[PDB]
């Protein structure tokens, strides 16, 4: 691998691993379109299994980028429109507060204060209907952004209804398979269990727990190789032969709302490049990323801007992931770890690496 890439990756990540006590890590850098891989440490400490290019990590909320692109593909197929009322796809949602809440609002966290998590008490489909029927918005639609699994997760579930496919079947057949993501899963199959890393939380080995709208909001597991291919696909959507998927990728990077220097896509978030690194680094901290923020509508949305820092953080109890790329430069990075370590440390390392290579 080019010595420049070797050196900047190792000089940034080795200290990160030490400071954050990360048990295992995989990194991919995409440079001029080509992937370069790096691994450290352990997928399973007790069984002494190393991280490899085939190790599966929980992506946590990086899953939201797959959801956003699947939804974009459904729009490109003509199956849904973001301007459609939520009730068009969920007729049982009759409560009056839903008047005016569209798929766009669900996809982009702007419905008016849907909560970060679906309550753990919501176990059945009837429980889920009750939850959404009884939910009272704090704000008018399209006025404030509040990052929420219950928002984008519902978007993902409704987006696939016209196809008649389950969310998992839709994702597999419409996104994973065409992109040759053959080791990316909503449910890890028995064949791949030997590769599924444990997450580590307070020194205990853990995997994500089942919950409502988990698949849609935070449930994808993938390898560093498949994630590098995901970044390649998002860097250069016009290379994708499947027309609706090519289009769905572009729709997910459109700019729908602005808060501060950040623009909300479908799953993806974007800032203009060059970025102020303090803006993305500090902005990634959950004290900011999870706050209620007024939004400005971008009317109409700006098509994907090539000069962007496009990124998404993800976590589960045991894992921490980060992806960022800059289309204009054919440059990107994926960082997968089996510890949920602070967001700003991820963004700082990613920017140090990409800035050096840019
Ligand atoms: B995304 O990664 O930003 C969603 N974050 S979250 O806070 O909603 C979340 C959701 C679910 C889990 C989890 N379920 N079972 N194990 N972990 C964890 C988390 C997070 F807190 F982010 F880790």
Please tell me the residue having the least CA distance from ligand 1 atom 16. 208
Distance 15 CA to ligand 1 centre (A): 25
Question: Tokens 């990160």 — which residue?
Answer: 16
Contacts of 355 (CB under 8 A, 6+ apart): 277
Q: What is the CA radius of gyration of the chain?
A: 19
To test ligand 1's pocket by mutation, which of 122, 211, 218 has the most ligand atoms within 8 angstroms of CB?
Answer: 218
315 marked as part of a ligand binding site: yes
* CA 6 – CA 220 distance, rounded (Å): 28
**Residue entry with tokens 């409560």:** 95
Contact at 8 Å (CB) between 62 and 230? no
Signed CA dihedral, 140, 142, 148, 153: sign only: positive
Where residue 202 falls (left for φ over 0; alpha for ψ -120 to 50; beta otherwise) is: left
Q: Find the 122 Cα to ligand 1 centroid distance in Å.
A: 16
As annotated, the active-site residues are 61
Beta bridge partners of 222: 57
CA 183 – CA 319 distance, rounded (Å)? 18
Residue nearest to atom 10 of ligand 1 (CA): 316
**How open is the CA angle 25-29-35, to the nearest 5 degrees?**
110
Token pair 């909300």: residue? 264
Mutate to test the pocket of ligand 1, among 316, 318, 341 (most ligand atoms within 8 A of CB): 316
Ligand 1 pocket (Cβ < 6 Å) reads 60-61, 116-117, 149, 208-209, 218, 314-317, 340
Tokens of 23: 């048990």
Locate 122 and state its tokens.
Answer: 């919501």
Confirm whether residue 340 is marked as ligand binding. Answer: yes
> Can you name the residues that pair with 332 across neighbouring β-strands?
30, 325
Provide the token pair at 246: 């090519």
3-state SS track over the chain: CCHHHHHHHHHHHHHHHHHHCCCEEEEEEEECCEEEEEEEEEEECCCCEECCCCCEEECHHHHHHHHHHHHHHHHHCCCCCCCCEHHHCCCCCCCHHHCCCEHHHHHHCCCCCCCCCCCCCCCCHHHHHHHHHHCCCCCCCCCEECCCHHHHHHHHHHHCCCCCCCHHHHHHHHHHCCCCCCCCECCCCHHHHHHECCEEECCEEECCCCCCCHHHHHCCEECHHHHHHHHHHHHCHHHCCCHHHHHHHHHHCCEEEEECCEEECCCCEEEECCCCHHHHHHHHCHHHHCCCEECEEEEEEECCCCCEEEEEEEEECCEEEEEEEEHHHCEEEEEEECECCCHHHHHHHHHHHHHHHC
Whole-number Cα distances in Å, 316 to 145, 173, 192, 334: 22, 25, 19, 16
**What's the CA angle centered on 244, arms 239 and 249, to 5 degrees?**
60
Cα atoms in the Cβ-side hemisphere of radius 13 Å centred on 193: 3
308 C-beta neighbours (distance < 10 Å), count: 23
The Cα angle at residue 228 between residues 223 and 233, in degrees rounded to 5: 125
Ligand 1 atom closest to Cα of 319? 23
Method: X-ray
Who contacts 164 (Cβ-Cβ below 8 Å, separation ≥6)?
none
First-to-last CA distance in the chain? 17
217 is in an annotated binding site: no
Edge-first strand order for the sheet with 319-326 is 49-50, 34-44, 24-31, 331-337, 319-326, 308-316, 269-272, 262-264, 255-259, 296-302
Domains in the chain, ordered, with CATH?
1-358 (3.40.710.10)
């Amino acid at each position: 691998a080019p010595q420049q890439i070797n050196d900047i990756v190792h000089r940034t990540i080795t200290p990160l691993i030490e400071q954050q006590k990360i048990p295992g890590m995989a990194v991919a850098v995409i440079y001029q379109g080509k992937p370069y891989y790096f691994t450290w440490g352990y997928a399973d400490i007790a069984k002494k299994q190393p991280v490899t290019q085939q190790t599966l990590f929980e992506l946590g909320s990086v899953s939201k980028t797959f959801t956003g692109v699947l939804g974009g593909d459904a729009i490109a197929r003509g199956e849904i429109k973001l301007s459609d009322p939520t009730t068009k796809y969920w007729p049982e949602l009759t409560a009056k507060q839903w008047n005016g809440i569209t798929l766009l609002h669900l996809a982009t966290y702007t419905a008016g204060g849907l909560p970060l998590q679906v309550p753990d008490e919501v176990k059945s489909s009837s429980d889920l209907l009750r939850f959404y029927q009884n939910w009272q918005p704090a704000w008018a639609p399209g006025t404030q952004r509040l990052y929420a699994n219950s928002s984008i997760g519902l978007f993902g579930a409704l987006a696939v209804k016209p196809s008649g496919l389950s969310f998992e079947q839709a994702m597999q057949t419409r996104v994973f398979q065409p992109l040759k993501l053959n080791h990316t899963w909503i449910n890890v199959p028995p064949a791949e269990e030997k590769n599924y890393a444990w997450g580590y939380r307070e020194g205990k080995a853990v995997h994500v727990s089942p919950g409502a709208l988990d698949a849609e909001a935070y449930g994808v597991k993938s390898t560093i190789e498949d994630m590098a291919r995901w970044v390649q696909s998002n860097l250069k959507p016009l290379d994708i032969n499947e027309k609706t998927l090519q289009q769905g990728i572009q729709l997910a990077q459109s700019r729908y709302w602005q808060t501060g220097d950040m623009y909300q896509g479908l799953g993806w978030e974007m800032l203009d490049w060059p970025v102020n690194p303090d803006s993305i680094i500090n902005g990634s901290d959950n004290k900011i990323a999870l706050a209620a923020r007024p939004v400005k509508a971008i009317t109409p949305p700006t098509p994907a801007v090539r000069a962007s820092w496009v990124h998404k953080t993800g976590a589960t109890g045991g894992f921490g992931s980060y992806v960022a790329f800059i289309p204009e430069k054919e440059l990107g990075i994926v960082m997968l770890a089996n510890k949920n370590y602070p967001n700003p440390a991820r963004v700082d390392a990613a920017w140090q690496i990409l800035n050096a290579l840019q």
